[PDB]
Amino acid sequence: TIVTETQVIRETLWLLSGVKKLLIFQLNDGKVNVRNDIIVTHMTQNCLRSVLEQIAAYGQVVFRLQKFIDEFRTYQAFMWALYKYFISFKEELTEIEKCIINKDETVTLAIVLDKLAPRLAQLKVLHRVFSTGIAEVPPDTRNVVRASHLLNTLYKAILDYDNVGEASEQTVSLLFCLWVETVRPYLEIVDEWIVHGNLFDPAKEFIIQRNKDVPFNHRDFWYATYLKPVLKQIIMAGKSMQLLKNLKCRSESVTCQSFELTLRSCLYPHIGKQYLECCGNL
């Protein structure tokens, strides 16, 4: 039969916004396929049907990324880094939608395919972070070792992708979007663990593996798994501030090179300016 040519691509551009539909059979997360029909024996035989099988995989990841969204903060901020990035993906979506509603449009199947092509590479590196992210959720006893090895694979992904590229810093910032935001609740417990003396660790999952023991003679026991000296400076300081609350006393990217271990070696004196000033008070 005849389906609408140059309008089914505006109707997949439809699907990519509102993700569950009837022109495209994305029934589940594992299988996302499209079937329109075979179209007629003149005027674009099968090329357009080959292009729809490509974008079937590109609506597949956004259905996977939305299925990851449900309604620690580290697992929630890693989820909101996905969603805060979506409005930068949804702004172009309204641009090409504004172009085709405005007559004349002067676009077709193929001349739009290079406009979303820089976005096409940006959405596939989104797939690699989240596919290497969740791999041990159907296994049980995930709690801290899943958090530790998905932060590890996030760090494994930023070593593989930023350090090899650097011709475009727009994706260099993008892999830093996924890093600086997940580490921020993993930071704000450390701020609470020093200047307030107490920390928050939930019971269903676990984080940095700091826990206070219930007896008074026991100080602090580090959980065994079943920069690191700067983390030991957090351990002794939060022990010492737990003591102190018990005591009653009285431009261009290529010149900025590169990138995340320089910012981390800025955070360690930021830890340091409290690790150096606590031990003076002890």
């Binding site: 600086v180 930071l187 701020d191 431009s251 320089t262 910012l263 800025c266």
Partner: peptide
């Protein structure tokens, strides 16, 4: 001082 350490990191990125 949570985002403040990251704000100085982004300030050091523009000055690097």
């Amino acid at each position: 001082a949570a985002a403040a350490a990251a704000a100085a990191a982004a300030a050091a990125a523009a000055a690097a």
